[PDB]
């Protein structure tokens, strides 16, 4: 009855030579990675961009997430009122997040095995006897708060040691984002234990790339694009009737589904733990979902080839 972890997605460890151009590298690994939907890329050991967000002034109001909101829908008094959220700094959010996780598991946050957090996450999502509520930061533009990468924009100070990172093609501010036609900037994610995102693809079936600047790992699940329609059919068969008819862009706001359910219906699913300093790439029309193991900070952008 415990969750069965999907097989691991490919992890690549490029040489310095392979690491010069991200689009060339992604094009070369595509024959394998597009068959798994997601892959993980570990930069060379010495590639360590400094964290460039203005942490002192970094303030944000997280949103609240109830893990079992869908299963709970199987009329509670005064529904719609979450209590409420307050404004945090990055530091005070992290204090809240660590206290939550260490209290939840009764152990220091870094001693909780990633497989236990995963098993407990999926138990909680389906449990009606236990309502767990977490908070996270998303819908956070790097244009308002600053990028996690140094940028030669004249707004902060680049040190000489930072300049190579401001100019690197793996700096997500330097990824190509313009689609060709006859006719964006990176976003930031502040996670805590159990905060999660449900199954979705990107607009225009775009690639996406995500960098975990620091913190505890981010656990991902990915489905290759060749199984996109099978995943959509399982969702339709098993989603609530009230939401079955909804357009994809709205339905993707509530498409939470245990990976084992998809696997039981023949949908291939792969997993990974993205750790600090690692990239995850999602391929075009590769459904993905995931959750955070603890307090962390990621940056992501949709790019075009």
Ligand X SMILES: Cc1[nH]c2c(C#N)cnn2c(=O)c1C(C)C
Phi-psi category of 175—alpha, beta or left, where left has phi over 0 and alpha has psi -120 to 50? beta
Determine which residue in the list 196, 206, 219, 273 makes contact with ligand X, applying CB under 6 A: 196
How far apart (Å, rounded) are the C-alpha atoms in residues 149 and 143? 12
Has 288 been labeled as part of a binding site? yes
Report the SS3 class of residue 287. Answer: coil
Say which DSSP state 8 is in: B
Considering the complex, what minimum distance in angstroms separates the CB of residue 62 from ligand X?
Answer: 9
Determine which residue in the list 298, 301, 302, 303 makes contact with ligand X, applying CB under 6 A: 298
Q: Decide if residue 292 touches ligand X (CB under 6 A).
A: yes
Mode of pairing for the β-strands spanning 38-41 and 11-12: parallel
Q: Decide if residue 29 touches ligand X (CB under 6 A).
A: no
Has 210 been labeled as part of a binding site? yes
How far apart (Å, rounded) are the C-alpha atoms in residues 85 and 88? 9
Determine which residue in the list 36, 168, 210, 273 makes contact with ligand X, applying CB under 6 A: 210
Considering the complex, what minimum distance in angstroms separates the CB of residue 251 from ligand X?
Answer: 16
Determine which residue in the list 138, 177, 254, 261 makes contact with ligand X, applying CB under 6 A: 138
Has 204 been labeled as part of a binding site? no
Has 200 been labeled as part of a binding site? yes
Distance of CA 39 to the CA centre of its chain: 13
Q: Decide if residue 219 touches ligand X (CB under 6 A).
A: no
Has 218 been labeled as part of a binding site? yes
Q: Which helix (H) or strand (E) holds 303?
A: strand 296-303
Compute, in degrees rounded to 10, the torsion defined by CA atoms 285, 25, 39, 298.
Answer: -90
Return residues touching ligand X (CB under 6 A).
136, 138, 189, 191, 195-197, 210, 218, 290, 292, 298
Annotated binding site for 2-oxoglutarate: 136, 208, 210, 218
């Amino acid at each position: 009855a415990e969750f069965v972890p999907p097989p691991e997605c490919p992890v690549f460890e490029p040489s310095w030579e392979e690491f010069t151009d991200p689009l060339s590298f992604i094009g070369r690994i595509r024959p394998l990675a597009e068959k798994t939907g997601i892959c993980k890329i570990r930069p060379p050991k010495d590639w360590q961009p400094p964290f460039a967000c203005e942490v002192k002034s970094f303030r944000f109001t997280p949103r609240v997430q109830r893990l079992n909101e869908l299963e709970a829908m199987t009329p509670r008094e005064a529904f719609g009122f979450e209590q409420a959220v307050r404004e945090y700094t990055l530091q005070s959010f992290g204090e809240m997040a660590d206290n939550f996780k260490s209290d939840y598991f009764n152990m220091p946050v870094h001693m909780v095995p990633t497989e236990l957090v995963e098993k407990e996450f999926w138990r909680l999502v389906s449990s009606i006897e236990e309502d767990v509520i977490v908070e996270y930061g998303a819908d956070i533009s790097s244009k308002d708060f600053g990028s996690g990468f140094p940028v030669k924009d004249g707004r902060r100070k680049i040190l000489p040691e930072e300049e190579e990172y401001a100019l690197s093609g793996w700096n997500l501010n330097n990824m190509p984002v313009l689609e060709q036609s006859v006719l964006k900037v990176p976003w930031l994610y502040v996670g805590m234990c159990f905060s999660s995102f449900c199954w979705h693809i990107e607009d225009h079936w775009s690639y996406s790339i995500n960098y975990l600047h620091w913190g505890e790992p981010k656990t991902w699940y990915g489905v290759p694009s060749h199984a996109a329609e099978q995943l959509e059919e399982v969702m339709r068969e098993l989603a609530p009737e009230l939401f079955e008819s909804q357009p994809d862009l709205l339905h993707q706001l509530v498409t939470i589904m245990n990976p084992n359910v998809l696997m039981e219906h023949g949908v291939p699913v792969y997993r990974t733990n993205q750790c600090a300093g690692e990239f995850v790439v999602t391929f075009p029309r590769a459904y993905h979902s995931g959750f955070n193991q603890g307090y962390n900070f990621a940056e992501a952008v949709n790019f075009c080839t």
